Ligand binder design. Structure first.
Ligand code: HEM
Ligand code: HEM
Ligand code: HEM
Ligand code: HEM
Ligand SMILES: [Fe+2]
Ligand SMILES: [Fe+2]
Ligand SMILES: [Fe+2]
Ligand SMILES: [Fe+2]
Ligand SMILES: [Fe+2]
Ligand SMILES: [Fe+2]
Ligand SMILES: [Fe+2]
Ligand SMILES: [Fe+2]
Ligand SMILES: [Fe+2]
Ligand SMILES: [Fe+2]
Ligand SMILES: [Fe+2]
Ligand SMILES: [Fe+2]
Ligand SMILES: [Fe+2]
Ligand SMILES: [Fe+2]
Ligand SMILES: [Fe+2]
Ligand SMILES: [Mg+2]
Ligand SMILES: [Mg+2]
Ligand SMILES: [Mg+2]
Ligand SMILES: [Mg+2]
Ligand SMILES: [Mg+2]
Ligand SMILES: [Mg+2]
Ligand SMILES: [Mg+2]
Ligand SMILES: [Mg+2]
Ligand SMILES: [Mg+2]
Ligand SMILES: [Mg+2]
Lengths: 155, 155, 155, 155, 155, 155, 155
């Protein structure tokens, strides 16, 4: 079914964001495991698979709407060098993508593509949760100290 | 453990190849499913997951060797527009990568990084299998005809 | 138990035929599977196993009759290059041999080696089946066309 | 996937060795059982099967590499007349072949056919094992005497 | 159903042979157990029950053919005094009966009593196996020595 | 099977290193347990057992090659007095043994003892893993402090 | 808890004897296995493990008593070249260590280290059991002959 040109453009924009998250989180996930911080690596890993599922949903929607998915463009990955910076980079990435998801939902609504809006709504609800976990870890670090926090992420 | 500079460089090259394969196959996988070719989609999908595992192993090895994994650079995906073309694009991708894996195995041997060579050999074996499956599909299209081949890929 | 000289010679002759069949069908089996024709590969593989079993039975009988089994001689192998040809070559073998089993049975009866006759009897009944199956495949190719036939042998 | 002509030639040479082993062991196995040496018969039988599996793997690799399997030529079979001799004949074959697998692995290395090398390595590890068992049986005969050794192979 | 007079005479001849085997093997079986050679006694015992089943089949066939079974005539039992002689006596008995079974099958064929021939065929196949086991034990005795052989027959 | 003289020397060299590791890791494991650092104790213990298994494999290969395993010369054990130092002693031992293993693999490859090379490659993979774990524990101590690190090792 | 200096010296002496036994028996175990004497190998193997457990108990006791376990000194291994010699080597070892164990027990009693005495009594009971088995094997060899004995150790 021929979809709205601007909607497909919006969906592709979002897909691009997801692909960046996929790579960033997978790399951060393995860096954590490499450092022996198994709990962070596991969670970071799960988030990576989550973003992978988000991208998959966008890809399927774009193809149904008869658009051409863009798996070619890969934006700037924000790779940190230590735990605090890595959590901040992931937080910065998620927060940098919100205006995009909200702008996409708003556009879909304006053109009546209610099903695309629903898909984006599900993704947004998940992104606000990831931001929640991230903000929480950063706050935990400040309340208990970096050494205790990292100690708690070992097993 | 500080790894050999040229070996890590080789591992990053291969990683870049795997990342390309990941994206190309996942897009082809969903394009197949989108067209109702379930069997091709399922097989294409699993190949994508396999390349994902290959990339994961390289990333883990690079980090142990104290190198910096490059998930930032993404080569040109070869996206086909119809089945025969998609099969040929995937075959071409795997064939362009062989010289790379063999060159890496050869280099690892020359410098004594036998563990890295073993990882690469495991990937090479899998790669020669995918090429086998791909060459086989193209040969099948030739023997039974495109219409019959696509019919056989529906369920 | 000293067996009849001519019977043992007949037995060794049939054994040579079996060893030929074993190798021919095993090569054909792997060629089919190499081309992605699983169904043909499975059947041919089973037939190869059946011939192996026949050879085993002849070998055992020969040894009991105090003769020397000859696994040294291997007659011409009739290797085909395509499905239709491979089917015809296998059919030719199952036929070129038929007169041998019948002649051995006739000889055993004439010299009173009723046990050897029964063993050959069992093999004969099985041989007339591989032939039945082979004749059927060729007639099937004629009724539905090579492309449809090959398609049906993929999975 | 076209393989190196010399590699395929080596593969065919090894395949010829395997086919000789298969037949020699199958005959020895049935000779053992015919004499009431059940244990010896079972081992030889299994060893015959393993050689069949080796031949099968070579045949598959050759086909994939786009070469033509030679199941036609069968070399000299070394048939023994009694236990001690049969063990020695099997040992010669298992040794005489060693140079071959080692030469093939060496050639595969030099031309970068690492997958073929690994297939040959698997077979090689197994061959050094059949040799071990054979050398042991002969050393055992020397330590306990032929009469005791044969008694121990009855049931 | 009125059977052929000569066939019934042949069947009675065979029954007589079976009855001799029954008694000879049962006696030899218990002598073995009496000497503590449980493995020989068990096998010898099983053979006795086997001959008992052969006789039973002949008896049933003779009665259907409306003949009078002769359980009255009992030929000369060949009782040995030691293991080697006992195995030879059993061997001599089985070999002395073959010409009779083969002559019976030949006669049945000449007069069209195909069902009687089938019954005799089953018995012949079993007798050639008993002869096999016997010849084997005698050969085993010569290869490993009488003391080792008897030792192996204790449990 | 008479193996290469220098290969055997190489294998005995690696065996010598393994024996040192066995004793060093076992004493360290029991020291950790004695101090109530159960987790560290369990891990050190299992590494001790893995080194015992490496020694075993080397001994078996040396015997097969008809060489004489040397379990008489015990090299210098590097025994620590506190966690940080024990991890460092184990790391130093592991690092000192790498050049030997790689030199042995290189030599086996040069004379065609491909099976010995494989055994050594297996051991090498395990050694690099232990080094990875060791380096990680030391990095962890520096990131969360020794007190936290040790607390996490109590159970 | 600070242990008696001389008690610890005795414990280290016994530990040294255990370390000799461990290596001697493990090598003998694999030699038996190497020659196909599985039964002897399995037993020798288990005894090697029992000595490993004795050493473990000694090490733990020494550490509790705040002494330094000595795993650096390795005494003269008594390696045999054939079964009878290996059994005698192990017997000589066990016999040589017996006076040492009894001297250690006597000393512990004199200084009131009853728990250390308990541990030594447990080990002594086990050592006298190995001596019993060893003496019995050598007596069995004289009673049934070396050839029969070795035959019985194959499985
Ligand atoms: C940096 C590139 C990537 C890496 C390193 C990676 C790695 C992985 C790994 C290790 C798994 C687990 C597979 C398993 O063990 O079963 C996985 C699963 C998967 N990936 Fe990726 N992946 C990458 C990119 C992608 C992309 C771009 C997509 C989407 C187009 C994607 C979609 C999926 C899906 C759908 C699954 C299965 C998720 C599930 O369990 O439901 N991946 N990936
Ligand atoms: C020429 C003499 C041969 C004889 C007498 C023989 C006999 C046998 C027998 C009796 C079996 C076991 C069947 C069963 O019980 O299911 C067997 C299995 C098998 N044979 Fe052969 N064989 C021969 C040659 C070969 C050759 C030349 C090949 C390869 C081209 C081959 C490949 C196989 C395979 C792959 C199996 C499967 C075994 C398993 O998966 O466990 N055989 N053979
Ligand atoms: C020397 C004379 C014989 C002796 C010592 C003898 C002894 C035995 C013994 C001990 C059994 C096992 C019974 C049980 O424990 O269940 C048996 C079974 C039997 N006997 Fe006999 N028997 C003799 C003669 C015969 C004869 C002459 C015939 C045939 C007319 C015969 C036919 C059978 C049958 C049919 C069975 C059962 C076999 C089965 O299990 O299928 N026996 N006999
Ligand atoms: C200080 C010297 C040694 C000590 C204290 C020691 C200790 C141990 C302990 C406590 C076990 C576990 C036994 C159980 O509870 O089942 C064991 C197992 C084992 N040890 Fe040792 N050992 C030593 C030396 C060796 C040596 C030198 C070898 C051989 C070259 C060796 C080979 C083995 C093997 C194969 C096992 C069994 C591993 C398995 O579970 O698969 N050990 N050892
Ligand atoms: Fe997302
Ligand atoms: Fe997110
Ligand atoms: Fe890959
Ligand atoms: Fe691939
Ligand atoms: Fe056949
Ligand atoms: Fe056939
Ligand atoms: Fe082989
Ligand atoms: Fe072999
Ligand atoms: Fe009978
Ligand atoms: Fe009989
Ligand atoms: Fe090791
Ligand atoms: Fe290690
Ligand atoms: Fe002990
Ligand atoms: Fe002991
Ligand atoms: Fe004996
Ligand atoms: Mg559509
Ligand atoms: Mg590290
Ligand atoms: Mg390898
Ligand atoms: Mg015979
Ligand atoms: Mg019939
Ligand atoms: Mg192909
Ligand atoms: Mg009636
Ligand atoms: Mg040996
Ligand atoms: Mg303490
Ligand atoms: Mg007490």
């Amino acid at each position: 079914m021929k979809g709205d040109k601007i909607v497909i453009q919006h969906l592709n924009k979002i897909l691009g964001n997801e692909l960046i998250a996929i790579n960033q989180y997978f790399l951060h996930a393995r860096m954590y495991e490499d450092w022996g911080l198994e709990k962070l690596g596991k969670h970071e890993y799960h988030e990576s698979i989550d973003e992978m599922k988000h991208a998959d949903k966008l890809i399927k929607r774009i193809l149904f709407l008869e658009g051409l998915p863009n798996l070619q463009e890969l934006g700037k990955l924000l790779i940190g060098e230590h735990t605090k910076e890595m959590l901040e980079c992931d937080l910065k990435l998620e927060q940098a993508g919100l205006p995009d998801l909200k702008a996409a939902i708003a556009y879909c609504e304006s053109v009546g593509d209610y099903a695309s809006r629903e898909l984006l709504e599900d993704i947004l609800e998940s992104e606000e949760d990831h931001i929640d976990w991230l903000e929480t870890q950063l706050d935990l670090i400040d309340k208990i100290g970096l050494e205790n926090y990292l100690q708690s992420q070992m097993d």
